[PDB]
Design a protein around this ligand. Structure first.
Ligand SMILES: Nc1ncnc2c1ncn2[C@@H]1O[C@H](COP(=O)(O)OP(=O)(O)NP(=O)(O)O)[C@@H](O)[C@H]1O
Ligand SMILES: [Mg+2]
Lengths: 585, 102
């Protein structure tokens, strides 16, 4: 008993101890700002410090969707630059005297986020878990994506300074010790947004790891992955990312700039390497593409004829007011369009395309990109977003025309879609070019609510196989039949009624233009199929089943950004534990 | 007249309609044309100064300056093959000191 009592205590002081840690990634995306609360198992060992078991990372709460950072900033500018700064020269050096107020406005948003996080923590964690989490500190990574990637002047980066200071002064009452630093909390580039999502996917599907289960050191000392790493396509609110690893030794054109995971510090040296193509396209997100598509379609003569715009991507029988404003499908089957500029889906693009944004004012090529998409930078905002000579939009439900319009407008435009200097510098102007220049046998996973709803809808109505493998022509068929549907108002509201007595489903604010996304998918799969190499397969997924069976977390870039930091164990240990929250004193 | 020793050879060669960089990228075609290179013409033509027999010097510095200014230093479109500079946030020499300065 005594002889054990001693060895018990001896084991204790000689081995590693496990402890739970909270990690918060706040997604400052285009559509909203929201928390994602993760738990992770940390291990501290004698003389070895502390690190995270990456396979233990799991989401435990996705937060409420609060105001995106654009709102905060434009609301700031309204007050302090004066109403309608979108249409006038505004001297930017003057807005430095309103820094404190930017802070104030940001404080309002952050208090909601903090409280929401805390709510998730309190509800999900038992008392014992709480002790460990409150003790270790809680790293917070707040990263802005496409919603503010295009934002002009110095405002965005000033905002991030203030955001970090706010994250680093959490309310002491709840006892969770949030903190951040300029590496964790920052704008992330399009390619990073891609790469992290790529990392997330392959982590969760256990394709990417360092151990013998997921790696082989080859005869020649190079660590390989045992299964092929998989590429990802993510269509968000404002942008879409395309990412895929290159089959090894692909000779690329000198202009195509691929990223090497080790070389570029995305993953530590002990992980397998790869050169991966990662490009993100502004205007290709659901909301962005929605507004741009309308502006371009309905200022083309083929579709606008004496006030009426015939839209091949909207159902026969559907019709709506002619603007890019947010569409509410009402119970009585009408479509209400919100004229409030903020809720107008052209607002981002129209704002970027101001003649008073130095990005246009001094760069003619950017002016040209605006004009090519029917935004005239010299006009005031209201005009810029107005669809000229157009009263109503009527749906003609013609999928193939929809496809070819998505093709020339969005996927293969004459000029690159505006605010895409990043994509272009990688060597890619358009989605078109990505698969013309680089291509890979790497299987591809398609992600994003929109994209998924597109396939699910066709599946639900038995127009696609349950076991749909990515065959383009099969998809074009299903979409062709589906998008032919007639819209019928009934007592139970507006109804999408399928051809050949094939059934029905309610029309609502989310599915009314879903055919566009079907066209986007078809277009994208066609370009893929045309590439020199073609992906071994294609799938659509929302989350990946964990070892348990249930998913540990969502697809996206959230897990990736955590992994990007925590995987560099010495650097992380230094920042997360040595400096930690105690730095804020 | 040996093409290789012609100081337009690099730029003329980049501006080929058969170089994918131009062929697929209209913005690059525009940049070429703005500097009087037509990508669709064969090389000899591309490098040829049209309708010109001799160049006579007029030795006028200020005009030289303002011509350097609009041609090289502050061109309408960025001088071709400068996607790198442009992605840093700089299209022309002009803009460098307008945007950052030290
Ligand atoms: N089932 C669905 N059907 C149709 N549209 C959807 C569906 N789910 C979401 N959406 C739309 O797609 C977008 C959701 O993408 P989301 O990733 O939430 O945007 P975000 O991350 O804020 N923008 P980004 O900066 O590109 O990351 C929203 O703008 C929704 O309007
Ligand atoms: Mg996103």
């Amino acid at each position: 008993v005594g002889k054990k009592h001693l060895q018990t205590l001896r084991n204790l002081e000689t081995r590693c101890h496990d402890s739970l840690q909270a990690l918060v990634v706040i997604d400052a995306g285009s559509s909203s700002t929201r928390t994602n609360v993760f738990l992770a198992k940390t291990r501290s060992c004698p003389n070895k410090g502390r690190s995270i078991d990456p396979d233990s990372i799991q989401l435990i709460g996705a937060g409420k969707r609060f105001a995106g950072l654009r709102v905060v900033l434009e609301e700031w500018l309204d007050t302090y630059a004066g109403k309608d700064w979108e249409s006038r020269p505004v001297d930017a050096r003057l807005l430095f005297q309103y820094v404190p107020q930017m802070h104030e406005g940001a404080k309002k948003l952050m208090q909601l986020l903090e409280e929401d996080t805390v709510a998730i923590l309190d509800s999900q964690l038992n008392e014992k878990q709480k002790v460990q989490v409150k003790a270790l500190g809680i790293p917070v990574m707040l990263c802005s994506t496409a919603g503010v990637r295009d934002f002009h002047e110095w405002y965005r980066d000033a905002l991030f300074v203030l955001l970090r200071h706010l994250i680093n002064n959490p309310s002491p009452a709840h006892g969770y010790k949030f903190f951040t630093n300029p590496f964790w909390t920052r704008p992330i580039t399009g390619a990073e947004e891609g790469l992290f999502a790529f990392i997330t996917l392959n982590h969760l599907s256990r394709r990417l790891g360092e151990d013998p289960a997921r790696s082989m050191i080859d005869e020649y000392g190079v660590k390989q992955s045992r299964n092929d790493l998989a590429g990802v396509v993510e269509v968000g609110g404002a942008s879409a990312q395309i990412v895929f690893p290159l089959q090894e030794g692909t000779v690329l054109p000198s202009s195509v700039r691929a990223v090497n995971l080790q070389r570029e510090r995305l993953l530590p040296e002990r992980y397998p390497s790869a050169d991966v193509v990662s490009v993100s396209f502004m205007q290709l997100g659901m909301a962005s593409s929605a507004g741009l598509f309308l502006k371009e379609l309905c200022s083309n003569d083929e579709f606008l004829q004496g006030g009426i715009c015939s839209n091949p991507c909207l159902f026969k029988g559907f019709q709506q007011s002619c603007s890019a404003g947010e569409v509410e499908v009402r119970p009585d089957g009408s479509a209400s369009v919100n004229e409030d500029v903020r809720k107008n889906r052209l607002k981002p693009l129209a704002t970027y395309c101001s003649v008073n944004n130095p990005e246009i004012s001094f760069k003619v090529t950017n002016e040209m990109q605006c004009r090519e998409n029917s935004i005239d930078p010299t006009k005031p905002l209201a005009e810029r977003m107005k669809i000229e000579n157009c009263s109503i939009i009527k749906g003609t439900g013609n999928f193939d025309k929809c496809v070819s319009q998505v093709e020339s407008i969005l996927v293969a435009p004459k000029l690159p879609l505006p605010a895409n200097i990043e994509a272009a510098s990688s060597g890619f102007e358009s989605v078109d070019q990505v698969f013309r220049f680089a291509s890979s046998t790497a299987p591809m996973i398609v992600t994003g609510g929109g994209m998924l709803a597109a396939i699910n809808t066709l599946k639900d109505h038995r127009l696609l196989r349950s076991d749909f493998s990515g065959d383009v022509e099969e998809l074009a068929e299903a979409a062709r039949e589906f998008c032919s549907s007639e819209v019928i108002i009934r007592t139970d509201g507006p109804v999408i009624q399928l051809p050949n007595a094939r059934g029905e489903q309610k029309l609502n604010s989310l599915n009314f233009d879903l055919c566009k996304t079907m066209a986007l998918t078809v277009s994208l799969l066609r370009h893929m199929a045309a590439g020199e190499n073609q992906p071994s397969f294609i799938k659509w997924e929302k989350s990946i089943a964990g070892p348990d069976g249930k998913p540990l977390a969502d697809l996206g870039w959230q897990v990736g950004v955590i992994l990007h930091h925590v995987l560099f164990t010495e650097e992380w240990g230094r920042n997360a534990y040595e400096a930690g929250y105690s730095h804020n004193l």
